[PDB]
């Protein structure tokens, strides 16, 4: 597409609008920055001849660009753009400049959880296989910076926030993991208006691939290639886990390092895009054999004194914790970290986990006390983070988990999960020696 010229408005900074700043100056246009907090996360990063409104959004500027490129984190449904589009101004964001301008095949993922394990693990299948691959989108590496001729490849996680704002995606291959209630605080309309940012994905896909186990993540109306625990193109066979495509077995889970059903899953979702972008199947097999896990997901930060404190900080949200719970083999007590920004979701779903002896809540953040709520009797609420870890600390025994998997935000007190994971490891590491 050609800028030259325009009006160009870009609502959010931090890396993403950061990174739109960089693209739109390399092309010979200046454009200018707005961001309704007082001060943004790159603001004193920013090159010093682009003007900037911070602490609210300017009309005036919206109002007289040519081309409004809005942030994830900003709601279309905000009064501003909204008028903005009614009034006929073209609003896109990072994702739609990237795919206009890549020159590669592009692998597209999203869902409500699995997402970067399995863009990460398609990565590896192609690096594996020899390929020049480039992987970021909604983890690592804003889109925009991936760019380059010499790419081959690229692998993109793409949140709900980012398919709003996207028209030009034409995916080798597209998949949606699963659907379960996350970001209710901007979808209004409840979860089907978020299941339809996430079916955007599958537009102009040359091949679509869906989850047999979840039926929301299939289109409304050739068919999608499709994964799945017993049904499904891609499968698995319990004599001992195996990995099959369609009754023939290609990997047994033993060789994986990663494990648990919902990894095996995310394994068979990486195969089938991996399939469908064109990458060998013996190099997609071997890669899935060395990969050992994303930080801060499920991660064992430290095993000691009989006792295993797992990060599972990448938990922002309900379904994600589920999984961490659900089949979990506890020796002793689990100690259950909970709390920071619900983002309005129904943690009901959780109760059934939380029975039993052997079970312990330390609810914080936010939304704490409604964690709490749970199962009251087995619970503490405290302020912060730290001073619930302070408070397990004492009780933790030979046998025990601690696990912090909060199945919230962390951006009401911290900068983002990974910091809220990395102070979980530094305070595991002083409590539990
Ligand atoms: N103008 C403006 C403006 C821009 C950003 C913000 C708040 O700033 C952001 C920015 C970009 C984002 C992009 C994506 C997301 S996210 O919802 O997809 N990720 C969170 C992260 C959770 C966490 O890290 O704990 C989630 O799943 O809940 C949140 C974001 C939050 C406020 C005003």
Not at 197 to 204: C, D, G, V
Not at 214 to 221: E, F, G, V
Request: proline share 4%.
């Amino acid at each position: 597409a050609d800028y030259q010229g325009k009006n160009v408005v870009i609502i959010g900074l931090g890396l993403t609008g950061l990174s739109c700043v960089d693209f739109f100056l390399a092309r010979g246009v200046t454009p200018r920055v707005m961001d309704t907090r007082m001060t943004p996360p790159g603001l004193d990063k920013l090159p010093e001849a682009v003007e900037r409104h911070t602490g609210s959004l300017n009309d005036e500027w919206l109002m007289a660009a040519d081309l409004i490129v809005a942030s994830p984190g900003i709601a279309l449904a905000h009064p501003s753009l909204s008028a903005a589009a009614d009034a006929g101004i073209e609003i896109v964001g990072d994702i739609e400049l990237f795919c206009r301008e890549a020159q590669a095949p592009i692998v597209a993922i999203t869902g409500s959880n699995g997402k970067s394990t399995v863009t990460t693990l398609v990565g590896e299948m192609a690096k594996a296989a020899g390929v020049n691959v480039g992987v970021g989108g909604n983890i690592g590496l804003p889109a925009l910076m991936l760019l380059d001729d010499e790419c081959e490849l690229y692998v993109l996680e793409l949140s709900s926030f980012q398919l709003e704002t996207t028209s030009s995606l034409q995916a080798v291959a597209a998949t949606i993991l699963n659907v379960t209630e996350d970001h209710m605080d901007r979808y209004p309309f409840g979860l089907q208006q978020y299941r339809a940012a996430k079916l955007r994905i599958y537009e102009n896909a040359k091949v679509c691939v869906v989850n047999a186990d979840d039926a929301l993540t299939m289109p409304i109306r050739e068919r999608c290639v499709s994964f799945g625990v017993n049904m499904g193109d891609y499968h698995l066979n319990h004599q001992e886990t195996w990995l099959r495509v369609k009754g023939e077995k290609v990997l047994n889970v033993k060789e994986m390092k990663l494990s648990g059903q919902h990894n095996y899953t995310n394994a068979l979702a990486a195969l089938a895009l991996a399939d469908a972008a064109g990458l060998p199947r013996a190099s997609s097999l071997k890669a899935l054999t060395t990969f050992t896990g994303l930080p801060h997901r499920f991660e064992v930060v430290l095993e000691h004194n009989g006792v295993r404190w797992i990060n599972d900080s990448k938990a922002t949200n309900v379904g994600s914790t589920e999984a961490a719970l659900n089949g979990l083999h506890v020796d002793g007590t689990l100690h259950l970290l909970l709390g920071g920004d619900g983002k309005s979701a129904d943690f009901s779903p959780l109760a059934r986990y939380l029975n039993g002896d052997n079970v312990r809540l330390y609810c914080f953040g936010r939304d704490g006390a409604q964690l709490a709520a749970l199962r009251p009797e087995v619970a503490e609420q405290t302020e912060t983070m730290e001073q619930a870890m302070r408070l397990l600390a004492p009780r933790v025994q030979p046998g025990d988990m601690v696990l912090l998997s909060p199945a919230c935000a962390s951006l009401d007190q911290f900068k983002n999960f990974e910091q809220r994971g990395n102070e979980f490891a530094r305070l595991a590491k002083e409590l539990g020696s």
